[PDB]
Amino acid sequence: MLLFCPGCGNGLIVEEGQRCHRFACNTCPYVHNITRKVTNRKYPKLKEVDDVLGGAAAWENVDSTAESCPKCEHPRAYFMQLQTRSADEPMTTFYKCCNAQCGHRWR
Amino acid sequence: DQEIVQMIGTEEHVMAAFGPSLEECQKAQIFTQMQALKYIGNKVRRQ
Amino acid sequence: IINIKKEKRETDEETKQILRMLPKDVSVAELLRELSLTKEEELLFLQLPDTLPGQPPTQDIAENACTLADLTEGQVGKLLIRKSGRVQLLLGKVTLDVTMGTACSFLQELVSVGLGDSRTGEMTVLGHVKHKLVCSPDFESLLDHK
Amino acid sequence: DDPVVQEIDVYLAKSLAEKLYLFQYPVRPASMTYDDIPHLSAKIKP
Ligand SMILES: [Zn+2]
Ligand SMILES: [Zn+2]
């Protein structure tokens, strides 16, 4: 930890004297011998995440259900709408249909 | 230095972050106002 | 090792780093425990406003600031403690409110430095200061009054 | 909220108006005091 001298208030460092390890300041003859054990834990953060991802139930966090696509007309789908282009007057669509492991990706 | 640390903050993470600054300051022989002013003047650019 | 000269932790309220083995108070409960729970006297440090609701008595004036240096001795006001924790100070027709100031943890020694002679004086340590009070005008009442 | 109890009076004293000083140590906690430390002198200016 951070310790300060009661005399002048400067930071105390740990050195070795003639009898035992002691805290001392660099601007005053104040010292303090260590009698019992002193500890300073920090408890660093541990890795809690298992880093497992990609589940089909978690992936199907989308609105698209029971629609009709021009590729395989399967019910389960995955739609995305984009409006980030002023030159294109209409909007932009991205539809994916992987109900029977098709994996389509078009505009 | 105790007054400086009290002015910075009394939180454990605050002291843990400010520790390296105190260590770098104690590495040099700057402990009074005159020495710090002399160091700054040495670092002062000519006008 | 000497017990009254150990190293002090950064937290002044938790300087007990090594051992041989605080909730924020309120002025009403403070005075209650200072008077009912115990009878020992206590030295307080309250901050009064810049101008008191009075006039300097024959001090050669102007609506200037009226501090304690102009008032005389004797009873100057009363300290009321209402319900729900209200702590007011009746200094005449108006009523100020007293709240807890910054909770100081460092040493504050109230001393009396009396320069009786022009060459040698006496410094008298009167006591220690622990709590700080703040007295403020009740501007809401002053506004709703007129 | 009426003033049920604790009707303390406030008195004023002018004996030590010009001789009262407030000394606070920003680096010394209130736990340790200078009562046992033998003092030697104090320089001061009016
Ligand atoms: Zn020191
Ligand atoms: Zn389909």
State the DSSP string of A53-100. Answer: ---HHHH--SS--S---TTT--S--EEEEE---SSSSS-EEEEE--TT
Q: Is A27 in contact with B31 (Cβ distance < 8 A)?
A: yes
Q: Bridge-partner residues for B4, per DSSP?
A: none
Q: Enter the resolution in angstroms.
A: 3.4
Q: Which amino acid, C64?
A: N
Other CB atoms within 10 Å distance of the CB of residue B3: 12
Residues of A in contact with C9 (CB under 8 A): 1, 3
Instruction: Choose among A1, A4, A42: nearest Cβ to B2.
Output: A4
Report yes or no: C129 and C111 within 8 Å, Cβ to Cβ. Answer: no
Strands C44-47 and C131-137: parallel
Terminal Cα distance for chain B, rounded: 32
- Nearest residue to A31 via CA among A52, A14, A53: A14
Question: Does any CB of chain C come closer than 8 Å to the CB of residue D38?
Answer: no
> Least CA distance to B8: which residue of chain C?
C10
The tokens of C59 are what?
């001090």
Domain covering A56-106, topology: N-terminal domain of TfIIb (2.20.25)
Computed on alpha carbons and rounded to an integer, the radius of gyration of chain B in Å comes to: 13
Tally of residues, chain C:
146
Helices (H) and strands (E) in chain D, counts: 0, 2
User: Is the Cβ–Cβ distance between C64 and C104 less than 8 Å?
Assistant: no
Q: Residue A48 in contact with residue A75, Cβ under 8 Å?
A: no
Q: How far is CA C96 from CA A75, C66, C87, C90, in A?
A: 74, 16, 9, 6
d(CA D5, CA C25): 19
Contact partners, residue C68, CB within 8 Å, separation at least 6: C48, C52, D12, D17
Ligand with smallest separation from the Cα of B31: 1
Distance (angstroms) between ligand 2 centre and the Cα of A106 equals: 12
Pairing between β-strand C87-90 and β-strand C74-81 as defined by DSSP bridges: antiparallel
Asked if residue A97 belongs to a known ligand binding site, the reply is no
B6 vs D: CB within 8 A: yes
Residues on chain A touching C17 (C-beta within 8 angstroms):
1, 3, 38
Structure tokens belonging to residue A95: 């539809």
Go through chain D and list every residue after which a break occurs, taking a C to next N gap over 2.5 angstroms, comma-separated: none
Which of C133, C140, C107 has its CA nearest to residue C26?
Answer: C133
C-chain CB neighbours of B10 within 8 Å are 10-11
- Name the token pair of C43: 């030295």
